[PDB]
Design a protein around this ligand. Structure first.
Ligand SMILES: *[C@@H]1O[C@H](CO)[C@@H](O)[C@H](O)[C@H]1NC(C)=O
Length: 246
């Protein structure tokens, strides 16, 4: 398991949590020095538990699929909550079984569905450590509209930050003041599958992407990533979605 406490949190302790999160994901191989997530894992070993504590010390446990860093569901006191999607129902066979009741959320976990339920795109939702504290608090008591927004915050400040060093740094900058994600942050989130694929395809193509990936950089400028010498590959991305899952 991995843990993070918002009480006394600072950029350093958050950095340690994201490091722990990355290190908890198993891999058998690196591709261009980036850990390659496994094609599959059987049984309960598929799911990592993240223990998150809000400023007041109240806690949720979040179940994460270690093959893709997708959040499946979470436990809040004696109630479990899972996304309305087959991967999450499968996860519900293995985690939080001791919950007194299980609620299936009225949406799947993908960004589009969550944004619909929340009533806003995540371009408009501030993120940061304060937002994460709020998210944890919201998820403690069932409110499906509120929870959609909370989950958009949770996903970005945990799994997204684990996937990209740039996103981890963006959250560290927002340790004591929330701010909506940079356009670059959004671009990277949207491009993780694509980038993971092209980095793997580059292995037998001399480091060259079969299809270029278009990203927005820090300055709001749109750019093309064509090969593994790019900063996105050498410095930024920290985990690869296995091409078998793409
Ligand atoms: C590869 O990408 C680098 C970094 O952006 C770029 O400067 C270069 O033009 C590209 N080289 C090849 C061979 O595609």
């Amino acid at each position: 398991d991995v843990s993070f406490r918002l009480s006394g949190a600072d950029p350093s302790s958050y950095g340690m949590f994201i490091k722990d999160l990355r290190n908890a994901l198993p891999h058998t191989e690196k591709v261009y020095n980036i850990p390659l997530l496994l094609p599959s894992v059987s049984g309960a070993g598929r799911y990592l538990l993240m223990h998150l504590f809000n400023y007041d010390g109240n806690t949720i446990t979040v179940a994460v699929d270690v093959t893709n860093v997708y959040i499946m569901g979470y436990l809040a006191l004696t109630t479990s909550y899972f996304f309305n999607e087959p991967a999450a129902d499968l996860a519900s066979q293995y985690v939080f079984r001791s919950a007194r009741r299980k609620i299936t959320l009225p949406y799947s976990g993908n960004y589009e569905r969550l944004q619909i339920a929340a009533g806003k795109p995540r371009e408009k939702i501030p993120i940061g450590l304060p937002a994460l504290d709020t998210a944890i608090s919201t998820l403690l008591h069932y409110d499906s509209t509120a929870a959609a927004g909370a989950l958009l915050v949770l996903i970005q400040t945990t799994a997204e930050a684990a996937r990209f060093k740039y996103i981890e740094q963006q959250i560290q900058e927002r340790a004591y003041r929330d701010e909506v994600p940079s356009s670059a942050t959004i671009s990277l989130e949207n491009s993780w599958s694509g980038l993971s694929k092209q980095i793997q395809l580059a292995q037998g193509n001399n480091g060259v992407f079969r299809t270029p990936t278009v990203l927005v950089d820090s300055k709001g400028n749109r750019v093309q990533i064509t090969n593994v010498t790019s900063n996105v590959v050498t410095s930024n991305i920290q985990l690869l979605l296995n091409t078998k899952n793409i």
